[PDB]
Design an enzyme around this catalytic site. Sequence first.
Site, PDB file in Angstrom:
ATOM      1  N   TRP A   5     -67.444  48.522  -5.040  1.00  0.00           N
ATOM      2  CA  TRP A   5     -68.824  48.991  -4.987  1.00  0.00           C
ATOM      3  C   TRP A   5     -69.167  50.171  -5.909  1.00  0.00           C
ATOM      4  CZ3 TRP A   5     -72.504  45.889  -4.215  1.00  0.00           C
ATOM      5  CH2 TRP A   5     -72.370  44.818  -3.316  1.00  0.00           C
ATOM      6  N   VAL A 161     -64.303  35.282   4.256  1.00  0.00           N
ATOM      7  CA  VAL A 161     -62.934  35.037   3.824  1.00  0.00           C
ATOM      8  C   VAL A 161     -62.097  34.640   5.040  1.00  0.00           C
ATOM      9  CG1 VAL A 161     -60.827  36.154   2.938  1.00  0.00           C
ATOM     10  CG2 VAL A 161     -63.016  36.502   1.761  1.00  0.00           C
ATOM     11  N   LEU A 411     -81.445  35.423   8.369  1.00  0.00           N
ATOM     12  CA  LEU A 411     -80.757  34.521   9.299  1.00  0.00           C
ATOM     13  C   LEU A 411     -79.299  34.887   9.514  1.00  0.00           C
ATOM     14  CD1 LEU A 411     -82.280  31.324   7.655  1.00  0.00           C
ATOM     15  CD2 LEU A 411     -83.068  32.354   9.806  1.00  0.00           C
TER      16      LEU A 411
HETATM   17  C1  LIG Z   1     -77.822  39.135  -8.999  1.00  0.00           C
HETATM   18  C2  LIG Z   1     -77.274  38.457  -7.755  1.00  0.00           C
HETATM   19  C3  LIG Z   1     -76.200  39.315  -7.090  1.00  0.00           C
HETATM   20  C4  LIG Z   1     -75.575  38.608  -5.887  1.00  0.00           C
HETATM   21  C5  LIG Z   1     -74.576  39.509  -5.153  1.00  0.00           C
HETATM   22  C6  LIG Z   1     -75.270  40.591  -4.325  1.00  0.00           C
HETATM   23  C7  LIG Z   1     -74.276  41.396  -3.492  1.00  0.00           C
HETATM   24  C8  LIG Z   1     -74.160  40.811  -2.084  1.00  0.00           C
HETATM   25  C9  LIG Z   1     -72.973  41.366  -1.296  1.00  0.00           C
HETATM   26  C10 LIG Z   1     -72.548  40.389  -0.198  1.00  0.00           C
HETATM   27  C11 LIG Z   1     -73.451  40.471   1.031  1.00  0.00           C
HETATM   28  C12 LIG Z   1     -72.747  39.976   2.286  1.00  0.00           C
HETATM   29  C13 LIG Z   1     -73.750  39.739   3.405  1.00  0.00           C
HETATM   30  C14 LIG Z   1     -73.045  39.109   4.585  1.00  0.00           C
HETATM   31  O1  LIG Z   1     -72.784  37.915   4.553  1.00  0.00           O
HETATM   32  S1  LIG Z   1     -72.610  40.032   5.913  1.00  0.00           S
HETATM   33  C15 LIG Z   1     -71.291  39.197   6.744  1.00  0.00           C
HETATM   34  C16 LIG Z   1     -69.978  39.385   5.984  1.00  0.00           C
HETATM   35  N1  LIG Z   1     -68.980  38.596   6.705  1.00  0.00           N
HETATM   36  C17 LIG Z   1     -68.261  38.924   7.784  1.00  0.00           C
HETATM   37  O2  LIG Z   1     -68.350  40.007   8.350  1.00  0.00           O
HETATM   38  C18 LIG Z   1     -67.316  37.848   8.285  1.00  0.00           C
HETATM   39  C19 LIG Z   1     -65.967  38.396   8.767  1.00  0.00           C
HETATM   40  N2  LIG Z   1     -65.334  39.025   7.615  1.00  0.00           N
HETATM   41  C20 LIG Z   1     -64.864  38.487   6.485  1.00  0.00           C
HETATM   42  O3  LIG Z   1     -64.889  37.286   6.253  1.00  0.00           O
HETATM   43  C21 LIG Z   1     -64.266  39.451   5.486  1.00  0.00           C
HETATM   44  O4  LIG Z   1     -63.799  40.622   6.187  1.00  0.00           O
HETATM   45  C22 LIG Z   1     -65.226  39.864   4.353  1.00  0.00           C
HETATM   46  C23 LIG Z   1     -65.558  38.676   3.442  1.00  0.00           C
HETATM   47  C24 LIG Z   1     -66.534  40.441   4.906  1.00  0.00           C
HETATM   48  C25 LIG Z   1     -64.543  40.953   3.502  1.00  0.00           C
HETATM   49  O5  LIG Z   1     -63.278  40.517   2.986  1.00  0.00           O
HETATM   50  P1  LIG Z   1     -61.872  41.284   3.290  1.00  0.00           P
HETATM   51  O6  LIG Z   1     -61.934  41.879   4.674  1.00  0.00           O
HETATM   52  O7  LIG Z   1     -60.767  40.330   2.939  1.00  0.00           O
HETATM   53  O8  LIG Z   1     -61.852  42.494   2.233  1.00  0.00           O
HETATM   54  P2  LIG Z   1     -61.418  42.303   0.693  1.00  0.00           P
HETATM   55  O9  LIG Z   1     -60.096  42.989   0.457  1.00  0.00           O
HETATM   56  O10 LIG Z   1     -61.592  40.873   0.247  1.00  0.00           O
HETATM   57  O11 LIG Z   1     -62.501  43.214  -0.070  1.00  0.00           O
HETATM   58  C26 LIG Z   1     -62.772  44.546   0.355  1.00  0.00           C
HETATM   59  C27 LIG Z   1     -64.083  44.988  -0.277  1.00  0.00           C
HETATM   60  O12 LIG Z   1     -65.156  44.269   0.337  1.00  0.00           O
HETATM   61  C28 LIG Z   1     -66.122  45.184   0.839  1.00  0.00           C
HETATM   62  N3  LIG Z   1     -66.796  44.612   2.029  1.00  0.00           N
HETATM   63  C29 LIG Z   1     -66.341  44.529   3.287  1.00  0.00           C
HETATM   64  N4  LIG Z   1     -67.293  43.937   4.048  1.00  0.00           N
HETATM   65  C30 LIG Z   1     -68.347  43.644   3.248  1.00  0.00           C
HETATM   66  C31 LIG Z   1     -69.588  43.041   3.443  1.00  0.00           C
HETATM   67  N5  LIG Z   1     -69.968  42.601   4.665  1.00  0.00           N
HETATM   68  N6  LIG Z   1     -70.433  42.908   2.393  1.00  0.00           N
HETATM   69  C32 LIG Z   1     -70.092  43.335   1.167  1.00  0.00           C
HETATM   70  N7  LIG Z   1     -68.904  43.916   0.955  1.00  0.00           N
HETATM   71  C33 LIG Z   1     -68.023  44.080   1.977  1.00  0.00           C
HETATM   72  C34 LIG Z   1     -65.355  46.471   1.103  1.00  0.00           C
HETATM   73  O13 LIG Z   1     -66.209  47.613   1.090  1.00  0.00           O
HETATM   74  C35 LIG Z   1     -64.370  46.465  -0.044  1.00  0.00           C
HETATM   75  O14 LIG Z   1     -64.983  46.968  -1.230  1.00  0.00           O
HETATM   76  P3  LIG Z   1     -64.713  48.473  -1.710  1.00  0.00           P
HETATM   77  O15 LIG Z   1     -65.258  49.455  -0.589  1.00  0.00           O
HETATM   78  O16 LIG Z   1     -63.131  48.614  -1.926  1.00  0.00           O
HETATM   79  O17 LIG Z   1     -65.481  48.794  -3.083  1.00  0.00           O
HETATM   80  C1  LIG Z   2     -78.537  38.695   9.683  1.00  0.00           C
HETATM   81  N1  LIG Z   2     -77.440  37.769   9.889  1.00  0.00           N
HETATM   82  C2  LIG Z   2     -76.772  37.722  11.174  1.00  0.00           C
HETATM   83  C3  LIG Z   2     -75.753  38.835  11.261  1.00  0.00           C
HETATM   84  C4  LIG Z   2     -75.745  39.893  12.163  1.00  0.00           C
HETATM   85  C5  LIG Z   2     -74.632  40.693  11.904  1.00  0.00           C
HETATM   86  C6  LIG Z   2     -74.225  41.940  12.621  1.00  0.00           C
HETATM   87  C7  LIG Z   2     -72.876  42.296  12.700  1.00  0.00           C
HETATM   88  C8  LIG Z   2     -72.490  43.465  13.364  1.00  0.00           C
HETATM   89  C9  LIG Z   2     -73.451  44.290  13.948  1.00  0.00           C
HETATM   90  C10 LIG Z   2     -74.800  43.941  13.863  1.00  0.00           C
HETATM   91  C11 LIG Z   2     -75.186  42.771  13.200  1.00  0.00           C
HETATM   92  N2  LIG Z   2     -73.968  40.148  10.862  1.00  0.00           N
HETATM   93  N3  LIG Z   2     -74.679  39.005  10.490  1.00  0.00           N
HETATM   94  C12 LIG Z   2     -74.093  38.263   9.345  1.00  0.00           C
END
Ligand SMILES: CCCCCCCCCCCCCC(=O)SCCNC(=O)CCNC(=O)[C@H](O)C(C)(C)COP(=O)(O)OP(=O)(O)OC[C@H]1O[C@@H](n2cnc3c(N)ncnc32)[C@H](O)[C@@H]1OP(=O)(O)O
Ligand SMILES: CNCc1cc(-c2ccccc2)nn1C
Length: 411
Positions: A5, A161, A411
Amino acid sequence: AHAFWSTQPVPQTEDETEKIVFAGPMDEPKTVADIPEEPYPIASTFEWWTPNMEAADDIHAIYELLRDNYVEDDDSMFRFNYSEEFLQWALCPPNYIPDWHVAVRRKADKKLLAFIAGVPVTLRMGTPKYMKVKAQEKGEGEEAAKYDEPRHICEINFLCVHKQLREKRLAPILIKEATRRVNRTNVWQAVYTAGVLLPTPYASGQYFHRSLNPEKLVEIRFSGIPAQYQKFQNPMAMLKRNYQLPSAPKNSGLREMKPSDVPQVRRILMNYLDSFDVGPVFSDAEISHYLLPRDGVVFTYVVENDKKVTDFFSFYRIPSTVIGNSNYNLLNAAYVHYYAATSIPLHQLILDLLIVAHSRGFDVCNMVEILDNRSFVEQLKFGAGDGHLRYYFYNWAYPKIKPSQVALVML
Ligand SMILES: CCCCCCCCCCCCCC(=O)SCCNC(=O)CCNC(=O)[C@H](O)C(C)(C)COP(=O)(O)OP(=O)(O)OC[C@H]1O[C@@H](n2cnc3c(N)ncnc32)[C@H](O)[C@@H]1OP(=O)(O)O
Ligand SMILES: CNCc1cc(-c2ccccc2)nn1C
């Protein structure tokens, strides 16, 4: 101490975002020509996959990854269980881009390991009203208005992931590749939400919940019996009395939304939404997609008096896996979607949403304090939860705003 980030076009601290005065991009201007044609590199045992979201098995593979690996609480009691029909609905709005759905499979057996989705949205994201006032005071009016026009951007959701692959830095890789594929379509901003704190949100709101089935909720430990109910002979009976609802809606002339309602609903939704700093712009096709009832997925009712649509509400279903209890496997939640009221108080309109949700077998009603959701919390007996939803932009400097200036439901 953000290794990914810190390298990205987002505000880095709260301190920084408090200084932000105008809306606008963070990054240098780029073209499609500048952006790599080739997918981002990954290890030889993995491959990039673009799933077909109109194909049942592809949807199903996404569904399974999320069912077992998506959002759960720290105590591992509940995990999101977005249905296949829900995912199809969410990932394929009108004029969606298949390439924006990005998956990782391991090359050997094509087992799904990772996913991120992007969908297009037309979003107003110009300088907020309170800063536009400050701009008028300083004679900096043109700078503040520069980006007033609604922007065609990307809405990011469903980052995931596999549990066996956590903390392997695979998520940055996913975000990079998504960013690449979106940039290649000439789109430079994204919007996303998360229950966790990242750098750096433009808005933050508490969750609120309304019990519809209090006995199930206590049993599955979603909620407890408040200490004050212990001063009663039968605590649970009182709790059931407290949350009980009418069997039928109260608003005369309430019915389900049909296709002919599209223009009336669009009109009243847009009039209402335009009064918020950040909010989507919906065409006819998008109102149809997002608000027309689809069984098990999205439920929408209009108030129609003397042949005219004057009010509507909508809500959508996300069940959760009940991880630890044996008697129940699913928590059936209804999430407040879009709405608009012009003929009646909001609390009167939303009461019927609770009524309807209850009669359909929903256990609870959820919402974030965006829109005017705060206006009916007390009287309809919502309680604040433990979570906060944060709102984020990618490559967009934006000042801090209150959650009640956000009109985008995610959503
Ligand atoms: C121009 C268009 C651009 C499009 C892109 C726009 C950006 C959109 C961004 C995405 C919007 C998502 C919206 C949703 O869907 S929010 C829901 C996200 N999903 C979950 O919570 C599901 C359960 N968790 C997992 O599947 C994993 O733990 C995830 C995939 C979340 C992290 O995988 P893992 O646990 O294996 O870690 P790592 O070693 O691979 O990577 C660690 C890095 O990832 C950063 N991290 C952790 N959590 C999040 C998070 N929720 N958003 C963004 N970053 C996150 C963390 O600060 C660290 O970076 P840094 O601090 O070292 O720098
Ligand atoms: C807007 N999409 C639904 C939702 C809700 C939450 C969430 C997870 C932890 C605390 C509060 C909301 N993650 N996600 C992916």
